[PDB]
Amino acid sequence: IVGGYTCGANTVPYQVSLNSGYHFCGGSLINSQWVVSAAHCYKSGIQVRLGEDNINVVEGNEQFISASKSIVHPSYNSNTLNNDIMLIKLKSAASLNSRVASISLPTSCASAGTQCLISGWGNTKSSGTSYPDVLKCLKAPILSDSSCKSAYPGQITSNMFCAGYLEGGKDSCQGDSGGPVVCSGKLQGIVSWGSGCAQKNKPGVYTKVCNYVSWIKQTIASN
């Protein structure tokens, strides 16, 4: 997260870190056994880390649970980036508590201009790299479809939206991928792609979760 702020420990209790001996992507807890992330974060050896603030220090509220299943959307396309969504099942159920809690799925899509909370442990600089110990947060609005398509001509599908700041300086970034965009208590987005980070006229692009609620529910019911 570039241009964000320190969230505060366990203030975003649905935020998970996907770990393979290091943090590589975010995710969002949606019930005690399932995490929503980005398809492009798929890999072997995933451990889900819940209850984290400082990802480099044991602080006492963590739960580390191996992924037993990783289910990428059936029509994910790694070229176009359409349908950049994956469901991860935990090998055993998390213990839900105040610091490890789920986020609601949308019942309807959010309007342009809706203010959302984006969070993660990704890079915090727009040039160069700095990776934070503690979770970072950014308030950012959803942009209009027209502004999004103007920013990325020919690239924006009905399963994507843009969010952020066209002046630059405030964006998600590498390592935030798979993590949440939460608006009025609903998981509306997944950190997906962009051009660099926090560049002028190049807002973040996010998977549009409201198109996937039936798929998510049916997938959880069958796996």
Ligand SMILES: COc1ccc(-c2ccc(C(=O)N[C@H](CO)C(C)(C)C)cc2C(=O)O)c(C(=O)Nc2ccc(C(=N)N)cc2)n1
């Ligand atoms: C598929 O969609 C996107 C969208 C954006 C990026 C991206 C993000 C940040 C940056 C980047 O500029 N990140 C930091 C920001 O400070 C640097 C300091 C490393 C430049 C670069 C890229 C890129 O396009 O190469 C990427 C991206 O990083 N893709 C990528 C693909 C292949 C390799 C590899 N085999 N070496 C590495 C990286 N992918």
Ligand SMILES: COc1ccc(-c2ccc(C(=O)N[C@H](CO)C(C)(C)C)cc2C(=O)O)c(C(=O)Nc2ccc(C(=N)N)cc2)n1
């Ligand atoms: C869509 O498919 C992919 C595939 C791979 C990447 C990617 C490439 C390199 C890396 C990366 O450089 N990872 C390092 C290790 O080299 C970390 C230390 C951040 C784990 C991260 C990512 C990522 O998924 O976030 C990314 C990727 O760069 N995504 C991304 C997400 C958001 C923005 C933005 N809002 N500005 C920019 C870029 N996207």
Ligand SMILES: [Ca+2]
């Ligand atoms: Ca920790």
